Write a protein that binds this DNA or RNA. Sequence first.
RNA 1: GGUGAAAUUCUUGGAUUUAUUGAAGACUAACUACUGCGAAAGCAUUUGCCAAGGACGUUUUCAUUAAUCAAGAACGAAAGUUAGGGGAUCGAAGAUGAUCAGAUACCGUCGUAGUCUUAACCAUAAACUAUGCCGACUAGGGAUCGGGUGGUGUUUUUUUAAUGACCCACUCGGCACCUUACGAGAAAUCAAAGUCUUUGGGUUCUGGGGGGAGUAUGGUCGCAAGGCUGAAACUUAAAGGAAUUG
Lengths: 128, 216, 96, 200, 25, 91, 97, 63
Amino acid sequence: NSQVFGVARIYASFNDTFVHVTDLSGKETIARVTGGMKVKADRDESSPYAAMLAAQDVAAKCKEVGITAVHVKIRATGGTRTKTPGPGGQAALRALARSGLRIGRIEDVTPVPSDSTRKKGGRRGRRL
Amino acid sequence: VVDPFTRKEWFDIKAPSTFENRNVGKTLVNKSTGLKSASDALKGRVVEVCLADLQGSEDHSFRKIKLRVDEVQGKNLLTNFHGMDFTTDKLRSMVRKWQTLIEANVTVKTSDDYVLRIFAIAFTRKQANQVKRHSYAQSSHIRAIRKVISEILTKEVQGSTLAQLTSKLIPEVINKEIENATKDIFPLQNIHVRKVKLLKQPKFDVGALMALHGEG
Amino acid sequence: SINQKLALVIKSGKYTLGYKSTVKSLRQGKSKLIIIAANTPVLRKSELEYYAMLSKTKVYYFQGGNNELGTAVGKLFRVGVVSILEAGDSDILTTL
Amino acid sequence: GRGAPLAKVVFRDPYKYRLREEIFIANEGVHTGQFIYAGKKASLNVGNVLPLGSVPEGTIVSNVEEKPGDRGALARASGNYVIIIGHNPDENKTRVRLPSGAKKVISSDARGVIGVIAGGGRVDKPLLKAGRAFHKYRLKRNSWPKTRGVAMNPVDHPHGGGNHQHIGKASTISRGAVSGQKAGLIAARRTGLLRGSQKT
Amino acid sequence: MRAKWRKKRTRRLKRKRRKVRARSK
Amino acid sequence: AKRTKKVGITGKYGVRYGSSLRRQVKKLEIQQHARYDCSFCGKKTVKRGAAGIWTCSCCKKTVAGGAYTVSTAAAATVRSTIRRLREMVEA
Amino acid sequence: PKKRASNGRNKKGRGHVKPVRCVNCSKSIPKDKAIKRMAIRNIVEAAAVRDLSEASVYPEYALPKTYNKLHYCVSCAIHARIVRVRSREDRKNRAPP
Amino acid sequence: TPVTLAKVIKVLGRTGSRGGVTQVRVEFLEDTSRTIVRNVKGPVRENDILVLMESEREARRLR
RNA sequence: GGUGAAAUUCUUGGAUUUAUUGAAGACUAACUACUGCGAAAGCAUUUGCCAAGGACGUUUUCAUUAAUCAAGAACGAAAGUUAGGGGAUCGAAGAUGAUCAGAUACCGUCGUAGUCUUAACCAUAAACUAUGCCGACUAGGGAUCGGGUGGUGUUUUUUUAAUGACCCACUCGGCACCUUACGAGAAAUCAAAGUCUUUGGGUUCUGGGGGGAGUAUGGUCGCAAGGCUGAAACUUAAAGGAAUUG
């Protein structure tokens, strides 16, 4: 068991994805890139292909520093927002598997209230 | 143009020896400098760990432990207990349609002056021939269950400390005595302690931290 | 609760109302329970505590003011202290 | 001249056998005949004089000193109080929020009474009367009545003159104007009716 | 012809109409 | 009998001043001239003396507080939050 | 014409229930009405389970499920195909498939 | 770029908006445990050989 | 960030995320139903007090003490309005950025009043079960909540006992439901909308073609916005209601 652990927070959202790596602690982050900082089209920021490339480069920096096995925490925007992961996290986690790293201990974390503040759209909704 | 991974060190954290796996992993600080120490940037970290990895089993994977960094000793650092939750898949996977959900919490300061706010979740269940579809509870019964759970949690915590609390919360003996203590009111599957929290620490208690540590 | 069994005391047993009559009975040894409304000044409070430590009677701090204690004794005024000589029917003297 | 009443507090002098007296701008709730504990090691009541290191985060304290020892400068008028905001334990400073909504970073050894100054709610009652405002000012200082600068002469004030009562040049006077020119809106960021954000 | 703007134009009908009668009376 | 319909204690302000300001001063004069319940002695025996000063006249006590009542809403939040934080200090 | 004898959905004998916000458009629709679906997903999809089990430590541990109970309104449900509009008679066909 | 060879397992059916893109499951020609859904442009029979510029897209139904 | 795709804005003075800790306010999800309670509006965290309350049980009690209600009174969602104390999130007005032939509109970013609350008004809603209220009878069923009763029933365990839960059968009350029509209806549909030309159990309101018009004016209430009461002149052959075919 010569494998050391880290944490990959994958924040999937309907505008962008986040792939973020920290230690077993929570401060002192390792490396994070997004599809939104990967491609330049401003609508492909939350593409599965975008999260795939972000996972590839996070895996590159991760294998360069030497972190091997990673606890995965995956989440949505949450709160009074969407609650549900977009098209990012799935392709990101698949690409992190196909990288050559090691993945364990996946559990969903996403912030969810005991009946928070109002949602945005105002009683009649985002009627388009 | 600076590349701080030429600066970040590697510290091996150690768990209290209640857990069989004393080793957990390695965190990282920046450089021990004058006026800005790596120990000082290490003083307040909190680590979340899967209790399957600490206990060496697999069935215990539905829990998570929050350890607290408080002391460092020469490329080695000691952790102290800070809180326990379940994991979200397990909490949702328990919570079913068609059964009431008995749920309680109590605050208690222990023998040593850790105060803890400690939670307990229990459900209803069927009884093996129940042709009625759903099996709820009268809410007067849920009152009786909260009373018994408050009594049994304050009894099984108040006369102990962090060490005996850890030794009780690992193998699930408290909810064992709870289930055994309320067979006689309502069925109650999935009796569990889901969330304990430290609130106020005592004075720094690092001798009991060695009473956790220091064997190996 | 305490209100029901105090109403039971005023129904059956016997009492005295008022500070002067309370301390007079407590010198005379005719009383067993002293009930103090919590808005009594701390001097008179601790004075009757000292007299209770002398007399080996039971004492109890009625959780409220003398208005609440007047309602608890069925009178339309304030009672700072009420001294139970004997309950008659209440088990208050046995419990608490 | 205050609305906020006072408490003549009788202390004991530890160094000489006498009774040294001090006057406090009281909080609410404090009363005649009240034991009142001042200093660091005391406990956090309403009426006691803790320092800001030994209050926790988020405590209502009034008559808060500004620098260590200067005997009370902040938050003393009839109904004010200072929230403690959040600390920095080394280099011992505490951040407070001031009754003008201000965020200040003051000395952790600054004292303060705990609570909110008595005589709150004073300005919710209309004066109604020149008579009422007259006695308010004749027990403060001679700054009432105020004749309008546009209804003086031009010699008396920079707005005076004209066959109407109008001003002519813009009435937002800057800070780098000289004295005699500063009588108007002084160095205004913005004017006009605030239908807008608190901007802090 | 239509009734909710019978209604809001009715309250503005009554506003203009009441003001002008309060002028003359 | 019935003295006035809706002005109350403000027959001493007459026909002057505008009815709105007579409303606010009706409410606040009721408050600052009404008696209160002294918790120190359980008697309805208080009056105002000045802004803040509230005296009980039977048991001859004084207590500082709001300019027009025995207590304000701000001081209610203050006593509860001091009681909370002092309890968690105890804890 | 009264289209439904259930009026929408099932109060039958309360008065006011609390309202709740549609997931897709945040319409504040009361909880009695307002299409409920409980959707669970595995955190990984169907094609990546073998991939992750091939690339995992801690052999044969578990694989947990995201749960979510999506509320929906009428407008969003019928617009996004959770619901189809049904014939006059099968309106009473209360059976999920 | 390590180009990917593939071999047809079975077609599913022409989807897309205008209809002109079929979906086929293919096996990577060296890993018989790994087959994958894949959008193809022209006409695809069974058991023939595909070329891929990447292997980890596995795109979905198009409308 | 944000979107249908964008731009307003925020960013090397480190924005978003991460972590730690604290504060602030509202909220009370997952349990969450063709379930409960309340006169209704309405009410979902624990615990305590405060008083209430329906139903059940009753070889108790009093013995018509009732049913329905003009004038009259209480409560009365939310928006309002009068001053506080709060004031986080969402957010009419407003600001902009979009979309457009134009957008003072939907979409985007904010933003006051509000949201919250204490004290005081207001008295309205699709306050909708669009079905007055009390009564008696008329048809099949299975689940449901609360109370009761029975069972050579089950279980819990320490051992049968004490329950408590579960099962079977009944009964009263309860929110509903599923089938048929003896019936009702103009019809959708209905266990009440049935027991109506074969027409009458007690009783309260309401409507009399559509507009005009909830306007006029008189009256009262209200700080005000407005409430309750409320026509006429004149105009028009329709306004409509379930249902069939296109």
